[PDB]
Amino acid sequence: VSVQQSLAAYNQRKADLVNRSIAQMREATTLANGVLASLNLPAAIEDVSGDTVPQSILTKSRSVIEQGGIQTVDQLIKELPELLQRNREILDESLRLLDEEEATDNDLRAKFKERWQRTPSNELYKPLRAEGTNFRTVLDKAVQADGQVKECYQSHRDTIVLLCKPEPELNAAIPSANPAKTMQGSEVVNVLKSLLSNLDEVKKEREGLENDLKSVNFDMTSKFLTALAQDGVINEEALSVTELDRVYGGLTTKVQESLKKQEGLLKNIQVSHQEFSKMKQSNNEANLREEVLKNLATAYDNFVELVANLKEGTKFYNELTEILVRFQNKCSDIVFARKTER
Amino acid sequence: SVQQSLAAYNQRKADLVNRSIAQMREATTLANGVLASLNLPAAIEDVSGDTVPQSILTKSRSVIEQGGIQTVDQLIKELPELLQRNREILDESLRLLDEEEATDNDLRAKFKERWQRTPSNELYKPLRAEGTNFRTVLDKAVQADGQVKECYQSHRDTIVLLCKPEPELNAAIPSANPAKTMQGSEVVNVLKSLLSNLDEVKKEREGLENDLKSVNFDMTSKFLTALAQDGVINEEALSVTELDRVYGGLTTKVQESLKKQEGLLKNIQVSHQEFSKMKQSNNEANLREEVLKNLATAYDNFVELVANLKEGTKFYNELTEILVRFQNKCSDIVFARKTER
């Protein structure tokens, strides 16, 4: 039972757990924004005129504009498969080095009866090709994600372009309608307002936790060593699960709190929206205005999300290159030693 | 056998998942079909018998912006080409097999025991079986498509109108008489609430279809560990348990969904009965209602028809990859047979 192996294991546990928590939080936020959009919140409670852009939607629009709007997404999409294909090329060249050595090794075997005493290159390259298949898998998974991310984008593009238009053009595209006249400073609107600001602190807090989880750095090597130095054996599992609780248990606690705080807030939001629905218009034009406002909140969310995604994508791809360039060097160094001992 | 236990365990899971999803779809299709048959909610939005009811006009918004009748025309016309493409690949594949097998047969005639390699008919037994099975899938698809085209040719007329602008759509819905005393009556109130409930039910189903589909628990690892630990064990009884643990909470909600609709439809009929008393016993009203109804059938048919073609299209493209691999396998085999032997 080796130390190196046991550390690899621990670091996987810790990676898993962090990555699981972060995905729990992001999955939930997407869902919270999801529900608001389906309810025209916060837009509805800001729409006193019924012929101007609700402020929240305006803030959202400005924001998109501060981030280069549809140009940003376009350029990022334009260059992703190019980074993708650069990685493919290095892996192929990696695997080609091994296939070229092996071909000559085998040709040598067919010519030289007595080569049976030497182990064939075929065997030498087993772990390398195994690593190789794992890279083809990561790359193919990347392409598929890339596919949907594009599919999704192309369906949302037009509304995001609307969201980017100068404020006058923007306001001229939201059908005007009758205000809900009653809302203006009522009990349900005051309620929804605070409920909505609290849910906003839950979302905004979830970025601190994410950073807190990712920056916990603990020296596990010294404990694995200490244990070994003492009992003469390493129980990797019980040891890691113990220290992981100790160091992340506080933060994972908070995650489940954050998740449950959303669940109840979202529940109370639904109830207060019911009573707020009682004073809203069902003119044909009130529906037109509502559809368009909902499209705009959804459009923003997708923008933030497509912009998040593509950025993790290009960073991932870039840091993938460094990783494959080492693999190649390694393949090349193994082939060169093979080719050269004799 | 490990491979044989795993497949079964997975099949049992697909059943639970798919049969749940089926129950939703049929339930929603049924509800819509009942709402249409009673001209709701159009009836309770239709005060002046000379305007297009909001909800019908709104359904009309969806159709026009979904591409209208053009979108359904392209998809339906190219599905038979998509299916014809796939036949050709399967026929090339088997034809390669046929060529080589004829040459093999002839070589065993000329030379007898001086031609000792496995006969090609024996070698190609599972391939021709693959082919046969592919053929079954393509024949089923072709037949299921005829069923879609025929139904659609008998629908399209009404779907045509829905795509027209408001003015021209209205001049196809005859006039009847204003409904002066209905909007705000208690009967209409109770009904409007009933329909609002039923709207929340079929809505929350989408949230369950997704939740059902996108459960990503690794219940196969747990199983394969059990198969490591013990020898021969009770796989079926185990499956029952592990699925109740994972999917149990959702099947519960699914039945709670169906019961809720069961009862809501019951009350709606009761309310409609009472509604069919303040409304007209007019020839003219019967003829307006008749169109209203068909316009709602049309929208429901549009939606379901597009979803079907999109899904029919997706799988015929996917059937292609599958067939290319099978053709490449048939070309690789036939090549070795010519070359390596």
UniProtKB/Swiss-Prot annotation, chain B:
The gene is PDCD6IP. It comes from the Eukaryota. The modification Phosphothreonine is found at T118. This is Programmed cell death 6-interacting protein. The modification Phosphoserine is found at S120. The chain holds residues 362 to 702 of 868 of the full protein. Residues 57-341 are annotated as: Interaction with SDCBP. Changing V137D: Reduces interaction with HIV-1 p6 and EIAV p9; abolishes rescue of PTAP-type L domain-deficient HIV-1 p6. It is linked to Microcephaly 29, primary, autosomal recessive: A form of microcephaly, a disease defined as a head circumference more than 3 standard deviations below the age, sex and ethnically matched mean. Brain weight is markedly reduced and the cerebral cortex is disproportionately small. MCPH29 is characterized by small head circumference apparent at birth and associated with global developmental delay, impaired intellectual development, speech delay, and behavioral abnormalities. Affected individuals also have poor overall growth with short stature, mild dysmorphic facial features, and seizures. May be phosphorylated on tyrosine residues by activated PDGFRB. Self-associates. Interacts with SH3KBP1/CIN85. Interacts with PDCD6 in a calcium -dependent manner. Interacts with TSG101 in a calcium-dependent manner; PDCD6IP homooligomerization may be required for TSG101-binding. Interacts with SGSM3. Directly interacts with CHMP4A, CHMP4B and CHMP4C. Directly interacts with CEP55 in a 1:2 stoechiometry. The interaction with CEP55 is required for PDCD6IP targeting to the midbody. May interact with PDGFRB. Interacts with SH3GL1 and SH3GL2/endophilin-1. Forms a complex with SDCBP and SDC2. Found in a complex with F-actin, TJP1/ZO-1 and PARD3. Multifunctional protein involved in endocytosis, multivesicular body biogenesis, membrane repair, cytokinesis, apoptosis and maintenance of tight junction integrity. Class E VPS protein involved in concentration and sorting of cargo proteins of the multivesicular body (MVB) for incorporation into intralumenal vesicles (ILVs) that are generated by invagination and scission from the limiting membrane of the endosome. Binds to the phospholipid lysobisphosphatidic acid (LBPA) which is abundant in MVBs internal membranes. (Microbial infection) Involved in HIV-1 virus budding. Can replace TSG101 it its role of supporting HIV-1 release; this function requires the interaction with CHMP4B. The ESCRT machinery also functions in topologically equivalent membrane fission events, such as enveloped virus budding (HIV-1 and other lentiviruses). It is found in: Cytoplasm, Cytosol; Melanosome; Cytoplasm, Cytoskeleton, Microtubule organizing center, Centrosome; Secreted, Extracellular exosome.
